[PDB]
Each structure stands twice: as structure tokens, then as C-alpha cells.
Amino acid sequence: SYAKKPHISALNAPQLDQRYKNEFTIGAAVEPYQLQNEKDVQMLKRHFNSIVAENVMKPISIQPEEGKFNFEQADRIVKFAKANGMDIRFHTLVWHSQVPQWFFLDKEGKPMVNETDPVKREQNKQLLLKRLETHIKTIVERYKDDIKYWDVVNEVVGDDGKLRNSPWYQIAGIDYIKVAFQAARKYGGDNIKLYMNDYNTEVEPKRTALYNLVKQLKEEGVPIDGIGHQSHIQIGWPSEAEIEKTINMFAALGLDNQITELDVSMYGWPPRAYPTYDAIPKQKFLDQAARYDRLFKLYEKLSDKISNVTFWGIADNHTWLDSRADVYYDANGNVVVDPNAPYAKVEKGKGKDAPFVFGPDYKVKPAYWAIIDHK
Ligand SMILES: OC[C@H]1O[C@H](O)[C@H](O)[C@@H](O)[C@H]1O
Ligand SMILES: OC[C@H]1O[C@H](O)[C@H](O)[C@@H](O)[C@H]1O
Numbered sequence: 464s465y466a467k468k469p470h471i472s473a474l475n476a477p478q479l480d481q482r483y484k485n486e487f488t489i490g491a492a493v494e495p496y497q498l499q500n501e502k503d504v505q506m507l508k509r510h511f512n513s514i515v516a517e518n519v520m521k522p523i524s525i526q527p528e529e530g531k532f533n534f535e536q537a538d539r540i541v542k543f544a545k546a547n548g549m550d551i552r553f554h555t556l557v558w559h560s561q562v563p564q565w566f567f568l569d570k571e572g573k574p575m576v577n578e579t580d581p582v583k584r585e586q587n588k589q590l591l592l593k594r595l596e597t598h599i600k601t602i603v604e605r606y607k608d609d610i611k612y613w614d615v616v617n618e619v620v621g622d623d624g625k626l627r628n629s630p631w632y633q634i635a636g637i638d639y640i641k642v643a644f645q646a647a648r649k650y651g652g653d654n655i656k657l658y659m660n661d662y663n664t665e666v667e668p669k670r671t672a673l674y675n676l677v678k679q680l681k682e683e684g685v686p687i688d689g690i691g692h693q694s695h696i697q698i699g700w701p702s703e704a705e706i707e708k709t710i711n712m713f714a715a716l717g718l719d720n721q722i723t724e725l726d727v728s729m730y731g732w733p734p735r736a737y738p739t740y741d742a743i744p745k746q747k748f749l750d751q752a753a754r755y756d757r758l759f760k761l762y763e764k765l766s767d768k769i770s771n772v773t774f775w776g777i778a779d780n781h782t783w784l785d786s787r788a789d790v791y792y793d794a795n796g797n798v799v800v801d802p803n804a805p806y807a808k809v810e811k812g813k814g815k816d817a818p819f820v821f822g823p824d825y826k827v828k829p830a831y832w833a834i835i836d837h838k
Contacts, residue, residue: 640685
């Protein structure tokens with residue numbers, strides 16, 4: 464069926480977002496440079512009705528120096544979204560990754576994490592939480608009328624099932640998460656939706672840890688409207704059953720669910736990638752299409768619990784997964800894709816992955832036909 468369909472140009476193909484109207488919006492992560500790209504722009508206007516900044520709205524991009532906010536790139540994304548009636552998601556207000564280090568220096572300029580005096584630690588905590596509020600207030604007040612969905616905190620639970628021990632936690636403990644949400648609500652109003660975003664939300668012990676955390680926060684009156692599931696998944700993992708169990712679990716707490724950074728990798732973990740996009744055989748696109756078919760069939764079934772599904776990219780010509788696309792080589796210098804085969808060396812991030820339902824040349828892939836139809 465969808466496997467025999469023609470690989471027509473995606474630029475004029477049936478609109479993806481329209482196919483899912485009344486079920487959930489369809490979004491894409493974007494980089495400013497793409498807004499100056501003829502085809503990326505066409506793709507956005509054509510298939511998507513929700514947009515998120517892939518990188519220009521993260522903490523270090525907004526306030527790399529205390530008191531100096533750089534909204535130039537962010538403004539460009541928001542402006543484009545408004546001009547095209549697209550919903551907007553804010554790519555995290557708090558995150559341990561690439562966090563501006565100045566946040567964690569005490570009044571004297573010393574690393575807060577080194578402080579041992581409980582009273583000085585309390586003082587440092589107040590300073591950090593104050594900075595956190597200023598950061599959130601400035602951003603939220605600037606975009607509250609345009610950006611409705613917000614990833615207030617990102618990846619705050621470790622993969623070991625424990626709260627991520629980042630400087631935020633080491634210094635302020637669990638309170639940095641409570642303050643982030645409360646600050647967002649206070650300065651953003653009751654109309655914006657606040658989310659806790661993370662990856663591997665379907666995997667234990669992370670899933671239950673995440674569950675308990677949000678359950679306790681809500682019990683304490685902390686304003687959190689939903690969970691963001693990054694969904695950096697593979698062809699057969701996590702299973703649809705676990706994804707469904709995960710979605711229902713959180714919806715049961717009265718939380719909204721949004722697939723925030725969806726991409727269906729062609730590989731496992733650790734990934735053994737193909738060296739180039741052309742090296743990827745049709746067979747791989749067929750297994751991927753079958754997965755996408757099951758995936759969006761499950762999402763529709765749960766449409767009452769999912770308000771948005773965003774892809775972490777537009778088309779296969781641009782995806783952060785290439786940075787993870789390690790190419791393995793045997794002793795004879797030949798590529799090794801078989802995950803169980805022996806190898807000699809590894810060329811990290813030199814390969815290519817193909818995530819999406821749209822190829823590098825902006826043509827629809829089998830995966831597209833699989834989620835565009837009603838079968
Ligand atoms: O953060 C990246 C990785 O995290 C976990 O190890 C996942 O199992 C793996 O698939 C990948 O998502
Ligand atoms: O969303 C997850 C992903 O986002 C960006 O692509 C970053 O560069 C990656 O390191 C990872 O944090």
C-alpha cells in the first residue's frame with residue numbers, strides 16, 4: 464500500500480497537520496537559518512501548525528551573561544510563527560545542559576557547589592533562585608502573548624531514576640523545580656501551559672521517578688499542566704505498549720501529554736550508522752514506515768490525551784541524530800552495521816541518520832504515506 468506509493472515532492476503533498484486536525488497539532492523544531500531557506504519555509508507553511516526553537520531559546524542562547532538578554536534569534540522564530548498562525552512551544556527555561564556558569568557563582572564569585580556552611584548555602588540558594596526567577600520573568604513577560612506551551616524544566620530526572628544531580632539541584636535542591644513552575648505561572652498568567660520535558664519517559668526507573676516527582680509537586684500546588692515526551696525513539700523501541708502505558712499513566716494525573724522532539728532513528732543504541740544517506744537501503748525505510756504506522760495509529764487512539772506531536776526537525780537533510788551517527792569499521796576498513804559484529808575502530812558522528820517522514824531532497828518517504836492515510 465503506502466510502500467508502493469510514489470516519492471512525490473513533499474512541498475505540495477497532502478498537508479500533515481490537516482490530516483490530524485482535531486486530534487493534535489503537528490510541529491517542527493527550527494533553526495533561524497531555515498527561515499531563510501526556500502524549501503524549509505515551504506515545508507513549514509505546508510505541513511506544520513506548531514513550531515519550536517531547536518536551539519536559540521535555551522538558557523545560554525538567551526542570557527549567556529547576567530543581565531544581558533539576546534532575543535534576536537528567538538524573535539525571528541516567534542515572528543515567523545505568528546505570521547503563519549502557528550502555535551509556539553518554548554524550548555526549556557531550565558536545563559542542566561550547556562547552562563550559563565555565572566548562575567552558580569556566589570556573591571563573592573566563588574562556585575556555590577563548594578560551599579559547606581549551611582547558612583551560606585541558604586544564602587546562595589536564595590541568589591540562584593532569584594536569578595532563576597529573573598531569567599523566567601524576563602522571557603515569559605516578553606512572549607506570554609505569543610507562546611502558549613512552555614518546557615519550564617528539561618531533563619531534571621536522571622536515567623538512574625534519581626533527580627539529576629546538576630548544579631541546580633546540588634545548590635537549591637528540589638526547590639529549583641518548584642520555583643521555575645511558579646515563576647512561569649506568576650509572570651505568564653493562567654493561559655499558558657507549563658510542561659516538564661524529558662526523554663526516555665517510557666523507561667523505568669526514570670518513568671516512575673518522573674511520575675512520583677510530578678505527583679508530589681501537584682500535591683504541593685505547583686502549577687504543572689503536562690509532560691513533554693521528547694520521544695527520541697527507535698524502530699522497535701520503546702514498544703507501542705510501553706508508550707501507551709506511559710501516556711495513560713500521566714493523563715491519569717490530569718496532565719496533558721505532548722510528543723516534543725520526535726525522531727525515529729534507523730539505528731539502535733549504541734548506534735552503528737551508515738556512512739552516507741545514499742548507503743541506507745530501501746529495507747530500512749520500510750521498517751521505519753511500519754513503525755511510524757503503528758506509532759501514529761497509537762497517537763490517534765490517544766488523541767484525547769495528546770495535544771501536540773512535534774518532530775525535532777523538518778526533513779532528513781538536517782537532524783541532530785547525525786551527531787550520534789557513529790560509523791563502525793572492521794579491520795579491513797569496511798563499514799559494520801550489524802550491531803553484534805566485531806569491529807576495529809569507530810568514527811564518531813560521521814554517519815547519517817534519516818528520522819523523519821521527509822527525505823533530504825524534500826520528497827515524501829514511505830513513512831509519510833503510512834501516517835497520512837486512514838488505514
Ligand atoms: O540520551 C541518549 C540515549 O539515552 C538512553 O541511553 C537511550 O536508551 C538511548 O536510546 C538514547 O536516547
Ligand atoms: O533535545 C535533545 C538534544 O538537543 C540538541 O540537539 C542538543 O545539541 C543535544 O545535545 C540534545 O541535548
